[PDB]
Amino acid sequence: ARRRRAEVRQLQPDLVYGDVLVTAFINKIMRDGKKNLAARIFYDACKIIQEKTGQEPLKVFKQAVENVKPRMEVRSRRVGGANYQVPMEVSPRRQQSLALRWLVQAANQRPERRAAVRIAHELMDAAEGKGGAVKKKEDVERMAEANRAYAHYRW
Amino acid sequence: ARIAGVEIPRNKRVDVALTYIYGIGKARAKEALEKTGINPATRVKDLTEAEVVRLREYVENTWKLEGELRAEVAANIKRLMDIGCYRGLRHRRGLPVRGQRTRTNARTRKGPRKTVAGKKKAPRK
Amino acid sequence: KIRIKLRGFDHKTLDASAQKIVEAARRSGAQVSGPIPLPTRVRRFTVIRGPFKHKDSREHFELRTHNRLVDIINPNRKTIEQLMTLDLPTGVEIEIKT
Amino acid sequence: ARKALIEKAKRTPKFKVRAYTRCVRCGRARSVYRFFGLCRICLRELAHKGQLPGVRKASW
Amino acid sequence: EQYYGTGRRKEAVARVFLRPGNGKVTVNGQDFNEYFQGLVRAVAALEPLRAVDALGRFDAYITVRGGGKSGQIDAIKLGIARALVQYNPDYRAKLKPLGFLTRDARVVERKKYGKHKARRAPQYSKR
Amino acid sequence: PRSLKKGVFVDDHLLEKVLELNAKGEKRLIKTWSRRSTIVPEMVGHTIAVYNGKQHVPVYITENMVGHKLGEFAPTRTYR
Amino acid sequence: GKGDRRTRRGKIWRGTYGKYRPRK
RNA sequence: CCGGGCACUCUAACGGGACUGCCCGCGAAAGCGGGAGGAAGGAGGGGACGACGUCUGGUCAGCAUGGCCCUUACGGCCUGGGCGACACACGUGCUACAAUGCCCACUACAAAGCGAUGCCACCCGGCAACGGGGAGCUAAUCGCAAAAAGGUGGGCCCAGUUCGGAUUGGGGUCUGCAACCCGACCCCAUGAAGCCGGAAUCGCUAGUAAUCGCGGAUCAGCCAUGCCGCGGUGAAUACG
Ligand SMILES: [K+]
Ligand SMILES: [K+]
Ligand SMILES: [Mg+2]
Ligand SMILES: [Mg+2]
Ligand SMILES: [Mg+2]
Ligand SMILES: [Mg+2]
Ligand SMILES: [Mg+2]
Ligand SMILES: [Mg+2]
Ligand SMILES: [Mg+2]
Ligand SMILES: [Mg+2]
Ligand SMILES: [Mg+2]
Ligand SMILES: [Mg+2]
Ligand SMILES: [Mg+2]
Ligand SMILES: [Mg+2]
Ligand SMILES: [Mg+2]
Ligand SMILES: [Mg+2]
Ligand SMILES: [Mg+2]
Ligand SMILES: [Mg+2]
Ligand SMILES: [Mg+2]
Ligand SMILES: [Mg+2]
Ligand SMILES: [Mg+2]
Ligand SMILES: [Mg+2]
Ligand SMILES: [Mg+2]
Ligand SMILES: [Mg+2]
Ligand SMILES: [Mg+2]
Ligand SMILES: [Mg+2]
Ligand SMILES: [Zn+2]
Known part of the structure; x- marks a missing residue:
């Protein structure tokens, strides 16, 4: 992107919750364009969070995401023969991106054999404040901050 | 059982x-x-x-x-081996026995690689 | 009630040939089935542009064969006359069955 | 295209198999088309001249 | 009595015949759900009706050929969208803004020579 | 996983030149270029010189090899 | 996988037929 | 399916359509941002097309060509062999290491193409490859042709495992004068490495990437998992 600033693709609201953030999460889950297989996985998970929990799946979702968003991160830079982890605030658009990506990433690290279960648990497990997705989010924030000395390199 | x-x-x-x-x-x-x-x-x-x-x-x-x-299998291979037979030879030398290339690949019958020295001059690729 | 086939390489050589027939026998036979456009069968040739190596250039050539029908019913007497031997198009070929 | 080898035209193959094509224009054996009896080179050439009826430059 | 449209998507056409009724939908002689057997996408197809509170005042007989299921899903979406305005031009006013009346032009891009498939270019080493 | 079908091929060059050499007993050497030919029963005991592409190689054909080809015994390439 | 000739995919991939993929 | 009808879908020729024309805002203009109507909006998407010139780039082995050189041989013919060697090294790819998966059923949904001594329906024989018989098509009309991914049901239960299909032993089928060197294919047995890959490195900005299958040229057959096309499902991201 050297000329313009690329406008963000606007997604199609969820087939069930009419939410755009859901389509995203689904997309991230999807691999090899198997959007059907993807969608189902998320949904089955929604029904799994619906059981083991009394709270609505949609709301559990929102929360987890919110909990896994990083508000700070270190972006490496060159300064007179040396690379520095420069803490940088994190763009809202990028937060949602990193959050959704991480959940799925962490989710597939889990031990439970069934996909939907892994998403299910990771998701609810996230809204609880725990889970590997949230640990990544924290390690990142710990990374930033911990280099506040190189913060004057605003970037 | x-x-x-x-x-x-x-x-x-x-x-x-x-x-x-x-x-x-x-x-x-x-x-x-x-x-x-x-x-x-x-x-x-x-x-x-x-x-x-x-x-x-x-x-x-x-x-x-x-x-x-x-x-039996053992016997068979020993057979084409004992007689002149080409396949026998390949079994002997321990190389592929079904008309495959031995320039590259053919690892399954040769085992691990026995690397050596060579010529790193000009694009040897 | 004659069934005629019109194939070729030029799509204007056949239009100036199917109508070369219809209009003529359009005043001596049935009102005809009009000229019907049969789908085309394309033949592609893909060649490496240069004589030696350079297998990444290639140029594309196609030999498209167009088709027609017409089909006039009522094999009238005054029909096989406005037609019969008054041909014009040279890049055309014609088949006839009825 | 050694003249001696363009003897391919020689029906007498002894065994139908041994019979192979060759460019009817350059003798080129390596990439001859059937519908033209021409190799990819000669073919490209004549097509440019317009001497190959119906054959056009395909684009899509 | 009847209302037609057409709708085409990624090279897949569909006959959309609307008629006043319940909500019954015959697609190639099958129930909508009979044809779109468990394809989360399906719902979308009928979205144009829900848009104008219809569905509960209409019925539809659909014929479809060409392409693939999800492409057909969209063809139907456009057919049904056109037929609805065929029954009432005033439907555009609020049916259009949701796009429904636009034909998706994006189609399989051509496979170029030298590439592995349109854009994917061959991998090169020690350059 | 070998296979021809029905008609165990054999160049008659030597066949009718061996099945005949059976009548007057045996013989000593038969140099051939047809390594294509399948070895068969009535060859057992003989000695066929098969051309490997540069030379004709002595091959005392025995029972144990009655079904193999003649080339199988005249190795083509020379290695290490 | 596509390399297993004794499976459906094996046959399809190799564009052949047989026990593991007869012609309907 | 028949009668029947061209509405529709198509098939394929010819036209209409978009012009920053309209409205608002900014300019001095050209234009820029935005809004309407529109299938489409400001080069709508893809292609063909690549200036004067550079690399004494590539090709005397497509062909043409100046000059050299051989002219019972550096010409010509065969039969056989080699181009298919292997301690070893690299490029490009294919198939994988699995549960977002593999297997067996049942059932859907394409587009381009190719086919008269060629596609080969259907039937019988065979586990099958394929044999034998045989209808149809000069092919929008018959055949290749199954679409696969999907969807539905069932099995496997985390294991080098119902993952993976290398290698090897058998027994066969085709093409062909002939498959030892050196063919593809089928069936039984065998069931390797491989648990996601160091340093380093490639592609792609959307119907693109990633995935799934289909056709064609060459061609008897084939070593195509290569090329050249076709359509299905279909992302992520671009501060800068
Ligand atoms: K030059
Ligand atoms: K191995
Ligand atoms: Mg070899
Ligand atoms: Mg090439
Ligand atoms: Mg010459
Ligand atoms: Mg040949
Ligand atoms: Mg040839
Ligand atoms: Mg594709
Ligand atoms: Mg290439
Ligand atoms: Mg398997
Ligand atoms: Mg030079
Ligand atoms: Mg150079
Ligand atoms: Mg010269
Ligand atoms: Mg070679
Ligand atoms: Mg060596
Ligand atoms: Mg490869
Ligand atoms: Mg049977
Ligand atoms: Mg062979
Ligand atoms: Mg066992
Ligand atoms: Mg191991
Ligand atoms: Mg494992
Ligand atoms: Mg670009
Ligand atoms: Mg193919
Ligand atoms: Mg072939
Ligand atoms: Mg091979
Ligand atoms: Mg192939
Ligand atoms: Zn030529």
């Missing part, structure tokens, strides 16, 4: 369990459990003596397996 020579498959569907025999494969396994009428899906642990005996009987008295197979 020990069927073929000291062969003990168990705790799995008899069809696959039967697979653990040298000379038996999905094909033959699916056969014996037919010509012997035995739900192939049953676990070896849940088999019945009547069945476990029929299996043994059929399979053992109907095919050349385990020690025998290994022996």
Whole structure:
């Protein structure tokens, strides 16, 4: 992107919750364009969070995401023969991106054999404040901050 | 249940369990459990003596397996080997015996690589 | 009630040939089935542009064969006359069955 | 295209197999088309001249 | 009595015949759900009706050929969208803003020579 | 996994030149270029010189090799 | 996988037929 | 399916359509941002097309060509061999290491193409490859042709395992004068490495990437998992 600033693709609201953030999460889950297989996985998970929990799946979702968003991160830079982890605030658009990506990433690290279960648990497990997705989010924030000395390199 | 020579498959569907025999494969396994009428899906642990005996009987008295197979096969390779035969040569030298390239690949029959020295001048790629 | 086939390489050589027939026998036979456009069968040739190596250039050539029908019913007497031997197009070929 | 080798035209193959094509224009044996009896080179050439009826430059 | 449209998507056309009724939908002689057997996408197809509170005042007989299921899903979406305005031009006013009346032009891009498939370019080493 | 079908091929060049050499007993050497030919029963005991592409190689054909081809015994390439 | 000639995909990939993929 | 009808879908020729024309805002203009109507909006998407010139780039082995050189041989013919060697090294790819998966059923939904001594329906024989018989098509009309991914049901239960299909032993089928060197294919047995890959490095900005299958040229057959096209499902991201 050297000329313009690329406008963000606007997604199609969820087939069930009419939410755009859901389509995203689904997309991230999807691999090899198997959007059907993807969608189902998320949904089955929604029904799994619906059981083991009394709270609505949609709301559990929102929360987890919110909990896994990083508000700070270190972006490496060159300064007179040396690379520095420069803490940088994190763009809202990028937060949602990193959050959704991480959940799925962490989710597939889990031990439970069934996909939907892994998403299910990771998701609810996230809204609880725990889970590997949230640990990544924290390690990142710990990374930033911990280099506040190189913060004057605003970037 | 020990069927073929000291062969003990168990705790799995008899069809696959039967697979653990040298000379038996999905094909033959699916056969014996037919010509012997035995739900192939049953676990070896849940088999019945009547069945476990029929299996043994059929399979053992109907095919050349385990020690025998290994022996015959061995005999065969030694055969084309003893006689002049080209395949014999390839078995000797230990190289592929079915018209494959030995310039690259052919690792399965050559084993690990025995790297040496060469020429790193100009794009040798 | 005659069934005629019109194939070719030029799509204007056939239009100036199917109508070369219809209009003529359009005043001596049935009102005809009009000219019907049969789908085309394309023949592609893909060649490496240069004589030696350079297998990444290639140029594409196609030999498309167009088709027609017409089909006039009522094999009238005054029809096989306005037609018969008054041909014009040279890049065309014609088949006839009825 | 050694003249001696363009003897391919020689029906007498002894065994139908041994019979192979060759460019009818350059003798080129290596990439001859059937519908033209021409190799990819000669073919490209004549097509440019317009001497290959119906054959056009395909684009899509 | 009847209302037609067409709708085409990624090279898949569909006949959309609307008629006043319940909500019954015959697609190639099958129930909508009979044809779109468990394809989360399906719902979308009928979205144009829900848009104008219809569905509960209409019925539809659909014929479809060409392409693939999800492409057909969209063809139907456009057919049904056109037929609805065929029954009432005033439907555009609020049916259009949701796009429904636009034909998706994006189609399989051509496979170029030298590439592995349109854009994917061959991998090169020690350059 | 070998296979021809029905008609165990054999260049008659030597066949009708060996099945004949059976009548007057045996013989000593038969140099051939047809390594294509399948070895068969009535060859056992003989000695066929097969051309490997540079030379004709002596091959005492024995029972144990009655089904193989003649080339199989005249190795083409020379290695290490 | 596509390399297993004794499976459906095996046959399809190799564009052949047989026990593991007969012509309907 | 028949009668029947060209509405529709198509098939394929010819036209209409978009012009920053309209409205608002900014300019001095050209234009820029935005809004309407529109299938489409400001080069709508893809292609063909690549200036004067550079690399004494590539090709005397497509062909043409100046000059050299051989002219019972540096010409010509065969039969056989080699181009298919291997301690070893690299490029490009294919198939994988699995549960977002593998297997077996049942059932859907394409587009381009190719086919008269060629596609080959259907039937019988064979586990099958394929044999034998045989209808149809000069092919929008008959055949290749199954679409696969999907969807539905069932099995496997985390294991080098129902993952993976290398290698090897058998027994066969085709093409062909002939498959030892050196063919593809089928069936039984065998069931390797491989648990996601160091340093380093490639592609792609959307119907693109990633995935799934289909056709064609060459061609008897084939070593195509290569090329050249076709359509299905279909992302992520671009501060800068
Ligand atoms: K030059
Ligand atoms: K191995
Ligand atoms: Mg076994
Ligand atoms: Mg070799
Ligand atoms: Mg090439
Ligand atoms: Mg010459
Ligand atoms: Mg040939
Ligand atoms: Mg040729
Ligand atoms: Mg594609
Ligand atoms: Mg290439
Ligand atoms: Mg397998
Ligand atoms: Mg030079
Ligand atoms: Mg150079
Ligand atoms: Mg010269
Ligand atoms: Mg070579
Ligand atoms: Mg060596
Ligand atoms: Mg490859
Ligand atoms: Mg049968
Ligand atoms: Mg061979
Ligand atoms: Mg291991
Ligand atoms: Mg494992
Ligand atoms: Mg670009
Ligand atoms: Mg193919
Ligand atoms: Mg071929
Ligand atoms: Mg090979
Ligand atoms: Mg192929
Ligand atoms: Zn030529």
